[PDB]
Amino acid sequence: SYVMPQSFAFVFPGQGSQHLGMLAELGLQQPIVLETFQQASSALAYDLWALVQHGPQERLDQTQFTQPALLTADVAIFRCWEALGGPKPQVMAGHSLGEYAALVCAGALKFEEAVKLVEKRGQYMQEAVPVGEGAMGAIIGLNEAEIESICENAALGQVVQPANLNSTDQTVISGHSEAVDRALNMAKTEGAKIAKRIPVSVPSHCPLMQPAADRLAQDIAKISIDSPKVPVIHNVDVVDHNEANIIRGALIKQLVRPVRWVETIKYIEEQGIKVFMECGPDNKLAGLIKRIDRQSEILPLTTTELILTAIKRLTH
């Protein structure tokens, strides 16, 4: 008899969630995975599946490859969810690059257009800061206020600021490499449990990305955007938007402003949604969400069995 399904959100991972061989199992099980990668490959003009399966590692980890790889992986998983009978989520959110996946899956952006766009996003971001001059760092155990103060004191004329607000006591900072190091050292001085560089060159979500944002804005103006059919909560402002130019603004501003992930998760939970499906490879967002709320449930979707389990959970 009738069972009201649990409300749920899809969360789409970004950078950091890529790995060689990702989706290999799902790719054997579900023809739509290879078809999706074929679509992406036609847009990119190289065999993306081959790159993701065989690498090399260093290749996959370069931004211009990571971005289309992860967008494609996230969309492939969404398509498998739908193919296996999964219903629409009540809301979607993606972490940085993941926001593009959310917009593709919400029907706002055409997949192959988005693939090309995120390749450009990666290319432009890579080029924004000369090699070695930027950095990102993870700080665990201090709150945002404490970290903001640290960044202000460490900057000394350079850029360093909160970049990803990931969980309540987990923040990534971004900026000039020297300033990031100064800030991380101050964070340790102030009692951070961890204050460490992350292995990226590109200082995303800070004003050093402005040159990339300017370039991407030109491309984004040319891409057709439809109103999302499922609300997508944007990183930059923690709200959904229906209007194309407002979505464009949100995507461009995203590059230079922090990813407000903890506020996004809190917003979703305040709406009564405590079941999250991680629509992509790896379990990085589950890690964050569980820290934000230990009572939340985050379900992986990386195999047919996991997808079917997740679908069943909605009514059981």
Q: What DSSP letter does each residue of 237-293 carry, written as one string?
A: TSS---SHHHHHHHHHHHTTS-B-HHHHHHHHHHTT--EEEE-SSSSHHHHHHHHH-
Interatomic CA distance for residues 261 and 288, integer angstroms: 9
Question: Nearest Cα to 96, choosing from 206, 181, 7?
Answer: 206
Spatial neighbors of 92 by CB under 8 A, at least 6 apart, are 9, 10, 11, 12, 102, 105, 106, 230, 231, 232, 233
Rounded to the nearest angstrom, the gap between the alpha carbon of residue 16 and the centroid of all alpha carbons in its chain is: 9
Interatomic CA distance for residues 243 and 251, integer angstroms: 12
- For residue 99 the two structure tokens come to 């926001």
Print burial letters for 98-126: b (CB count within 10 Å at least 16), e (below 16).
bbbbbbbbbebbbbebbbbbbbbbbbbbb
User: What is the residue type of 152?
Assistant: E
- For residue 277 the two structure tokens come to 């499906």
CA distances (Å), 61 to each of 8, 55, 73, 103, in order?
A: 31, 9, 14, 23
Interatomic CA distance for residues 182 and 102, integer angstroms: 35
Query: Is-contact 101 12, C-beta < 8 A?
Result: yes
Give 227's DSSP letter. Answer: P
DSSP H or E segment with residue 232: none
Query: Is-contact 76 37, C-beta < 8 A?
Result: yes
Place of tokens 């980890």: 61
Interatomic CA distance for residues 51 and 289, integer angstroms: 30
SS3 assignment, position 312: helix
Query: Is-contact 75 113, C-beta < 8 A?
Result: no
Place of tokens 């939340």: 296
Interatomic CA distance for residues 205 and 174, integer angstroms: 7
Place of tokens 């940085």: 96
CA distances (Å), 297 to each of 192, 267, 268, 288, in order?
A: 27, 16, 13, 12
Q: What technique was this entry resolved by?
A: X-ray
SS3 assignment, position 19: coil
DSSP H or E segment with residue 164: strand 160-167
Interatomic CA distance for residues 54 and 35, integer angstroms: 18
- For residue 2 the two structure tokens come to 């009738």
Q: What is the resolution of this structure in A?
A: 1.5
- For the four alpha carbons of 246, 119, 262 and 282, in that order, the dihedral sign comes to positive
Interatomic CA distance for residues 167 and 86, integer angstroms: 28
End-to-end alpha carbon distance in the chain: 12
Residue 157: CB atoms within 10 Å: 6
- For residue 293 the two structure tokens come to 């709320």
Kindly list the structural domains of the chain, giving each domain's residue range(s) and its CATH number in brackets, ordered by start. 1-128+202-316 (3.40.366.10), 129-201 (3.30.70.250)
Question: Nearest Cα to 274, choosing from 17, 53, 89?
Answer: 89
Catalytic residues: 96, 205
Interatomic CA distance for residues 155 and 44, integer angstroms: 39
- Prior bond to 130 cis, omega within 30? no
Interatomic CA distance for residues 299 and 249, integer angstroms: 31
Query: Is-contact 9 275, C-beta < 8 A?
Result: yes
Spatial neighbors of 68 by CB under 8 A, at least 6 apart, are 40, 44, 48, 115, 118, 119, 122
- For residue 138 the two structure tokens come to 């993870």
Q: What values do phi and psi take at 275, rounded to 5? A: -115, 125
Query: Is-contact 93 49, C-beta < 8 A?
Result: no
Residue 259: CB atoms within 10 Å: 25
Interatomic CA distance for residues 190 and 151, integer angstroms: 12
- For the four alpha carbons of 42, 45, 47 and 49, in that order, the dihedral sign comes to negative
Interatomic CA distance for residues 235 and 249, integer angstroms: 12
